[PDB]
């Protein structure tokens, strides 16, 4: 009936869903809002749907919180963010479409602050608070997605909205003392020529050393160094990127660290299907949670047919890695509460060149797997080409059928009995240079053989993994019928993909560990956890 609906990923009972909106925590209750189409499996009639949770895994339904009802949002209620004011009151800033189809920024607040589920929201008659006009010269067609705001040292609030002027991406900053009267700043928080429109911006602090999250307005301390992350969704490429840097509060400008540029060359949170991501500070457990939208890789016809489209990945905790050059991600630990009591284990299994090992006793279509690979004699690894810089193209030109010294070796998920269908998540090791001791670790998510149906988008994804092959390579994959979330090197590389196998469905799906490389690899350990379905909206 619905072979591709997920058992533990967030998604509405039906219809189209896109950007996650106003993620927040209030009175111990997690809130998730999201762009939803009340009457279609394609984008349209967009409103802010609403759901609440106490563990970020199980979600309870609620009526749409924000939907067209006034001139300032008559043609649509687009994405936005929630900010928790000092007095503990949560407010929402969202982009609305006015009568002339112009994008404007409106504020919304709860009607009953005593309601922990914040079911009803009211919209200020002062809206819009920020709008495109002849005075500011902002592009009325490219001015959207207000972020969560942060309080400045001068007690004035700051907020940025995604925009652009021609080909220059912009993070337009506004300031306010009362959160009502907002003044456009002369200079943007940041920009970049050639990137194109900047959507779903995000700006937050991260601790230099540690995995704990940091309140969005927190200032740097002489003994507490804080870095700042600027994240934007590039409309031109459909990918989410981020850069690590410092915050010049004097000029009110973001300053990327050396080797960082806010554009298509910056790092991504996820190298597969992932967009419009947004974080929020979970003051309940001192962590920053990242929400990300993953659209369908199936045809629109299939979408209309199944009656829905779009899911959110499993929320994940994010923090700065020790090197300080990238962020690390890991699904919230609460998802582990879905793992079956009895886990399937496999230790010290030597995978010989061209061999594969099947993992029995687990619902291969809805599980969580974590493997530890131990390579043998790295000197045997091929020397990567000097010019190769695109991980995706390497995975594309050197697919699973192409052998090498070390790899392809990893996992075959959502696979059929006789591998007629399968999604391959693996590693491939290259030697930095001839006789060198430095190695390049590549992570691939190949869906070229994921389904017999050809209308599905089987694009292959790839990403480099900042880990040393001399130590066991870590790999994790969350399998959920039509979505696979792969984590390499304990979250140093993430790849989300959507597949729709015609055979590898439900009970007929299988899980395999494999090694098609010339040099055999050793599977130190492997844990497969059947995942129980969650109660979601
Ligand atoms: C959610 O919605 C969809 C996901 O469903 C997503 O939209 C895009 O997803 C992919 C990007 O991740 C796009 O994938 C590309 O597909 C091309 C292949 O298409 C197939 O073959 C024909 C096209 O050549 C055609 O029969 C069909 O596709 C149609 O093509 C026309 C183009 O005229 C297009 O307008 C239509 O929309 C159709 O897509 C077939 O399905 C393919 O060329 C692309 O692959 C190249 O690039 C990838 C990296 O992105 C790389 O891995 C490959 O190796 C390949 O590389 C080429 O260039 C190299 C040079 O560097 C060469 O060396 C090499 O030989 C190759 O020539 C790519 O896979 C997909 O088209 C697109 N889908 C649609 C309909 O928009 C959204 O992004 C997503 N939304 C959000 C917000 O997340
Ligand atoms: C801002 O408004 C829209 C934002 O999309 C821009 O219109 C696009 O312009 C490009 C050229 O760079 C065309 O290829 C697209 O077809 C246009 N699409 C739309 C929305 O019509 C517009 O150019 C921008 N204006 C300025 C000066 O920033
Ligand atoms: C406000 O919300 C609380 C909690 O849901 C509820 O007990 C109370 O009756 C509500 N007050 C009204 C009538 O708005």
Same domain, 380 and 323: no
Same domain, 432 and 446: yes
Question: For 419, how many CA atoms within 13 A lie in the half-sphere containing its CB?
Answer: 13
Nearest atom of ligand 3 to the alpha carbon of 119? 5
Query: Does ligand 3 have an atom closer than 6 angstroms to the CB of 115?
Result: yes
Same domain, 323 and 344: no
* CATH code (residue 416): 2.60.120.560
Give 27 Cα–ligand 3 centroid separation in angstroms.
Answer: 14
Q: Is residue 131 part of a domain?
A: yes
* CATH code (residue 319): 2.115.10.20
Relative to the alpha carbon of 114, which ligand is closest?
Answer: 3
Q: Which two tokens stand for residue 101?
A: 């189809």
Q: Which two tokens stand for residue 460?
A: 């292959």
Those residues whose C-beta lies under 8 Å from the C-beta of residue 123, and which sit 6 or more positions away, are: 66, 69, 70, 72, 73, 106, 107, 108
Q: Which two tokens stand for residue 156?
A: 């004035």
Relative to the alpha carbon of 446, which ligand is closest?
Answer: 1
Nearest atom of ligand 2 to the alpha carbon of 166? 28
Same domain, 279 and 400: no
Among 445, 484, 491, smallest CA distance to 467 is for: 491
Same domain, 332 and 352: no
Same domain, 86 and 174: yes
112, 113, 116, 120: residue to mutate for ligand 3 pocket, most atoms within 8 A of CB: 112
> 48: annotated binding-site residue?
no
Catalytic residue flag (residue 19) = yes
Q: Is residue 165 part of a domain?
A: yes
The verdict on whether omega for the bond into residue 128 sits within 30 degrees of 0, i.e. cis, is yes
Give 223 Cα–ligand 3 centroid separation in angstroms.
Answer: 45
Same domain, 503 and 375: yes
> How far out from the chain centre does Cα 351 lie?
32
CA distance 284 to 311: 25
> 79: annotated binding-site residue?
yes
- Domains: count for the chain: 2
Query: What secondary structure does DSSP assign to 450-471, as a single string?
Result: S-S-TTS----EEEEE---TTS
Q: Is residue 430 part of a domain?
A: yes
Q: Which two tokens stand for residue 20?
A: 């996650």
313, 459, 462: residue to mutate for ligand 1 pocket, most atoms within 8 A of CB: 459
Same domain, 279 and 311: yes
| Closest residue to atom 14 of ligand 3, CA basis | 112
Residue 338 phi, psi (nearest 5):
-90, -20
> 18: annotated binding-site residue?
yes
Domain that holds residue 379: 340-531
Same domain, 328 and 347: no
Give 163 Cα–ligand 2 centroid separation in angstroms.
Answer: 11
Those residues whose C-beta lies under 8 Å from the C-beta of residue 473, and which sit 6 or more positions away, are: 372, 373, 374, 375, 427, 441, 465, 467, 488, 489
List b or e across 11-47, with b for residues whose CB sees 16 or more CB atoms inside 10 angstroms.
bbebbbbbbbbbbbbbeebbbbbbbbbeebbeeeebb
Same domain, 325 and 402: no
Q: Is residue 537 part of a domain?
A: yes
Give 136 Cα–ligand 2 centroid separation in angstroms.
Answer: 17
Same domain, 275 and 414: no
Nearest atom of ligand 1 to the alpha carbon of 395? 52
CA distance 243 to 238: 17
Give 149 Cα–ligand 2 centroid separation in angstroms.
Answer: 28
Q: Is residue 6 part of a domain?
A: no
The approach used to solve this structure was X-ray
> 17: annotated binding-site residue?
yes
> 457: annotated binding-site residue?
no
Same domain, 108 and 38: yes
Query: Does ligand 1 have an atom closer than 6 angstroms to the CB of 273?
Result: yes
State how beta strands 483-488 and 493-498 pair.
Answer: antiparallel
Strand partners, 96: 77, 104
Q: Is residue 2 part of a domain?
A: no
Burial of residue 2, with CB atoms counted within 10 A of its CB: 0-12 exposed, 13-18 middle, 19 or more buried = exposed
C-alpha distances (whole Å) from 408 to each of 252, 277, 377, 483, 515 are: 47, 30, 15, 21, 6
Q: Is residue 79 part of a domain?
A: yes
Q: Is residue 3 part of a domain?
A: no
CA distance 175 to 186: 11
């Amino acid at each position: 009936n619905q072979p591709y609906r997920t058992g533990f990923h967030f998604q509405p009972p039906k219809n189209w869903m896109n950007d996650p909106n106003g993620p927040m925590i209030y009175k111990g209750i997690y809130h998730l809002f999201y762009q939803w189409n009340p009457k279609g499996a394609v984008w349209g009639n967009i409103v802010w749907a609403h759901s609440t949770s106490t563990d970020l895994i199980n979600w309870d339904p609620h009526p749409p919180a924000i939907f067209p009802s006034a001139p300032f949002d008559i043609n649509g209620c687009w994405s936005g963010s929630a900010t928790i004011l000092p007095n503990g009151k949560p407010v929402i800033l969202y982009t609305g479409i006015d009568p002339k189809n112009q994008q404007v920024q409106n504020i919304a607040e709860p009607k009953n602050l005593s309601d922990p589920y914040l079911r009803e929201w009211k919209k200020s008659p002062l809206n819009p608070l920020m709008a495109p006009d002849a005075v500011n010269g902002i592009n009325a067609s490219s001015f959207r997605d207000p972020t969560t705001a942060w309080l400045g040292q001068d007690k004035k609030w700051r907020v940025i909205i995604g925009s652009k002027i021609h080909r220059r991406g912009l993070a337009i900053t506004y300031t306010s003392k009362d959160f009502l009267k907002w003044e456009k700043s002369p200079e943007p928080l940041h920009y970049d020529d050639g990137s194109g429109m900047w959507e779903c911006p995000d700006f937050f602090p991260v601790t230099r050393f540690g995995s704990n999250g940091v309140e969005t307005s927190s200032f740097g301390e002489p003994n507490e160094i804080l870095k700042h992350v600027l994240k934007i969704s590039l409309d031109d490429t459909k990918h989410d990127y981020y850069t690590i840097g410092t915050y010049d509060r004097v000029k009110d400008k973001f300053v990327p660290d050396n080797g960082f540029k806010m554009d298509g060359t910056a790092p991504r949170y996820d190298y597969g299907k992932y967009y419009a991501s947004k974080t929020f500070f979970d003051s309940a457990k001192n962590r920053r949670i990242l929400w990300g939208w993953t659209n369908e890789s199936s045809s629109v016809e299939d979408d209309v047919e199944k009656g829905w489209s779009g899911i959110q990945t499993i929320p994940r905790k994010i923090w700065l890695d020790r090197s300080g050059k990238q962020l690390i991600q890991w699904p919230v630990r609460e998802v582990e509460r879905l793992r079956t009591k009895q886990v399937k284990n496999l230790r010290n299994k030597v995978l010989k060149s061209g061999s594969r090992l099947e993992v029995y006793g687990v619902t291969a279509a809805q599980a969580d797997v974590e493997v530890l690979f131990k390579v043998r004699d790295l000197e045997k690894a091929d020397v990567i080409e000097p010019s190769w810089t695109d991980p995706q193209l390497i995975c594309s030109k050197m697919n699973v059928s192409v052998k090498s010294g070390l790899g392809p070796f990893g996992l075959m998920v959502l696979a059929s009995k006789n591998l007629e269908e399968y999604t391959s998540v693996y590693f491939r090791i290259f030697k930095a240079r001839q006789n060198s001791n430095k190695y390049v670790v590549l992570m691939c998510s190949d869906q070229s053989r994921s389904s017999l149906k050809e209308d599905n988008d089987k694009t292959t994804y790839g990403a480099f993994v900042d880990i040393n092959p001399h130590q066991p390579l870590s790999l994790r994959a969350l399998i959920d019928h039509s979505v696979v979330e792969s984590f390499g090197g304990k979250g140093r590389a993430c790849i989300t993909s959507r597949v729709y196998p015609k055979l590898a469905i439900g009970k007929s799906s299988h899980l395999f560990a494999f090694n098609y490389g010339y040099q055999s690899v050793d599977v130190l350990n492997l844990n497969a956890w059947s995942m129980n379905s969650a109660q979601i909206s």
